[PDB]
Every structure is written in C-alpha cells, then in structure tokens.
C-alpha cells in the first residue's frame, strides 16, 4: 500500500477527490507549440504529478490540468479583466471543448488520460459579462468562466462530464485508482 | 411582483439562489400521473399543478413550480420504497443510458410559461458491492431512480448530454432566461 497525494492547489479538484472517501495529502509544486491541446494538457498533468512523485517516490501522486479550447485555440487563466471579457465574447452563442487530463504516478505504475466535454453557451450580453467579471469568479478559471456559481447561467448544455469541466473526471479517476489497488 | 418558489427541494433552493433575487418558499400539496399521457406531458402537468396551487393562494405573485422524472424505455422510476427496490432500480440503470426530464412552470395572473428540459444520463456498469454500499448511506432513498448526480452517485455517471442543473431538479439557465419574460 502507498499513500495518495493530490499534486494540486485547486479547491474544486480537492472537493471532487473528497468524494472518494480515501485519505490523502495535498502537495503543490513549482510549475510546446509543436504539441496539440490534447498532448499539451496531458503533458502538464504529467509534469505536475512527476514534480511531487520525484520528491515522494513511495506514493501514488495525482496531477491534473484543464484547458478551454475552440477552433484549435486554447484559453488560459485571463491575466487582465478586459482579456476575460474578450474570451467571453468568443465563447458566446457557440460550443467549445473543455479538456481535462489526469496523470496518476507511482514507482511501479503510471497512467495518464484526457477527458473532452463539449460545452454550449447561450448568446451573452455585454452587461452580463462585466457583472460576472466583478464577482472575481472568472479570473481563477481557464477560459474566464466556471460551470459552478454565476457561470452556470451562461451554459446552455454539455456533452460529457460536468466534474471534468470542474477540473477532475472523478468517476474515471476512481476507476483508474482501482488498478493502483486504490492504496 | 414578488417571486415564490413552490418547492421544498434544497437543490432547487440552492439553484434559484444563484439568481440573487429575493423570493419566498411556499408549497401546497397537489399527485396521480395518468398512463395515457407521455412522461413529457406528465412532468409538465405536475410542475404546472404545483405552481398553480400556490398561485391561487398568491394571485399577485410570480410562482415557480418544478418536477423531475428519471425514465428509461418509456418507464419512469420513483423514489424507492425499500432498499431491495433501490438495488432493483440501480441494476436497471447500470451500464446504459436513461433520461432525466425536468419541467418548470412559471405562473402569474397575466402570463404563464411551461417547458421541460431533457438530459441523457449514461451510467458505468455497476457491481453488487457498489450498489449496496451506495444504498448503505441512504442517498438513493430520497431520490427518483435511486441515485443523485451529486455526492457518491457522481461515481456511477459516465457522462451526460444536456443540463447538469436540470438533473439536480432545476434548469437554472432556462429558468433565469424565462424570468426575464416576466
């Protein structure tokens, strides 16, 4: 048996991993154009898990990364408030992909995968964009929106995993951890 | 006009709270869904009856009523009566898809609007151990179809095609949009 480590500072990933009712600890570590968004998100989840697994080689380390992509271009956490409003205008009245990769690392076993969810947005007004920006909820999230909180009002529907949109495909994470014998 | 949520559902309360609008919770018990009607007709009839019953008591108000059904192969599943029935319902939902239909009815003296939102829910194949341990925490017993998308029930869901909030009992983005019409 090996102790479980969540290599993430994300409160959403913490809340989702708590659903497993498995004891674990949290450690956050210090974080290519030729790659596709699918390769990039998998690579980043891997680097996050490996940085902590290198420091604690006796444990099972979970790393994850979430990207918001549309027409091949991915949107990261917006630096400015105007950039956050620009991302929202691009997302308005259409569909985009939310890609979440998970990497599970142990000395004798490693597993990396991504989950893709299609997210459809209603057509949004300028007023709704800035009043949502004022809440401070967009700044912390990729693509300048969260499916929870006030961001829930922009979402018309999804085709995929809501928990994966939050930052962790918890049902798949649970299934992958069974082959690490959970502990 | 003042806003009334004709539901005691904590999930519908937490969702209607996202709107940042003042409202009160008022309920009046209504029940029998006829087999001659489709589940889509019935769920809308139920959301209507719940809102109308409270609207008759508060005719100056805007009243929101809602109802949620979990259906597969035209058959809809209610809250389980016993743990053996809850395991029967989950065994049926395992390894396949079902529909979650939520109807919302907004009632006022000069305007009324009813609609349903349909979501496809796909489950992983479930073991007998998984079903009984989930039953052993009493989360199924309170819910239609013997499961919830939140909590330990989250681990059974493979994917959805629709609205997660509608599965919780309220399509919050459609409701918000419909309240602008009022």
Residue numbers in the entry:
A (entry chain B): 2 to 32, 37 to 188
B (entry chain A): 3 to 32, 34 to 185
Publication text:
Maf (for multicopy associated filamentation) proteins represent a large family of conserved proteins implicated in cell division arrest but whose biochemical activity remains unknown. Here, we show that the prokaryotic and eukaryotic Maf proteins exhibit nucleotide pyrophosphatase activity against 5-methyl-UTP, pseudo-UTP, 5-methyl-CTP, and 7-methyl-GTP, which represent the most abundant modified bases in all organisms, as well as against canonical nucleotides dTTP, UTP, and CTP. The protomer structures of the four Maf proteins revealed a large β sheet containing seven β strands (β1 to β7) with two α-helical subdomains on one side and one long α helix on another side. Thus, pyrophosphatase activity of Maf proteins toward canonical and modified nucleotides might provide the molecular mechanism for a dual role of these proteins in cell division arrest and house cleaning.
Previously, BSU28050 has also been reported to exist as a dimer in solution (Minasov et al., 2000). Analysis of the crystal contacts using the quaternary prediction server PISA suggested that the Maf proteins form dimers through multiple interactions between residues located on their C-terminal regions (155–183 in BSU28050, 181–202 in ASMTL-Maf, and 155–193 in YceF). In BSU28050, the pyrophosphate-like molecule is coordinated by the side chains of conserved Ser9 (2.7 Å), Arg14 (2.8 Å and 2.9 Å), and Lys53 (3.0 Å), and its position is similar to that expected for the β-γ-pyrophosphate part of a nucleoside triphosphate substrate. Near the catalytic Asp residue, there are three conserved positive residues (Arg14, Lys53, and Lys82 in BSU28050 and Arg24, Lys65, and Lys100 in ASMTL-Maf) whose side chains have a trigonal orientation in the active site and are arranged similarly to the triphosphate binding site of the E. coli dITPase RdgB (Lys13, Lys53, and Arg87) (Savchenko et al., 2007). In contrast, in the structures of the YhdE-like Maf proteins BSU28050 and ASMTL-Maf, the nucleoside-binding pocket is partially occluded by the guanidine group of an Arg residue (Arg13 in BSU28050, Arg12 in YhdE, Arg29 in YOR111W, and Arg23 in ASMTL-Maf). However, in the structures of BSU28050 and ASMTL-Maf, the side chains of Gln153 and Gln179, respectively, are oriented slightly away from the substrate-binding pocket; therefore, they cannot contribute to base recognition in this conformation. After a minor repositioning of the Arg13 side chain out of base pocket and the Gln153 side chain toward it, the binding pocket of BSU28050 can readily accommodate pyrimidine nucleoside triphosphates in a productive mode. The side chain amide group of Gln153 and the main chain NH group of Ile152 can form three H-bonds to the O2, N3, and O4 groups of thymine, whereas the repositioned guanidine group of Arg13 can make an additional H-bond to the thymine O2.
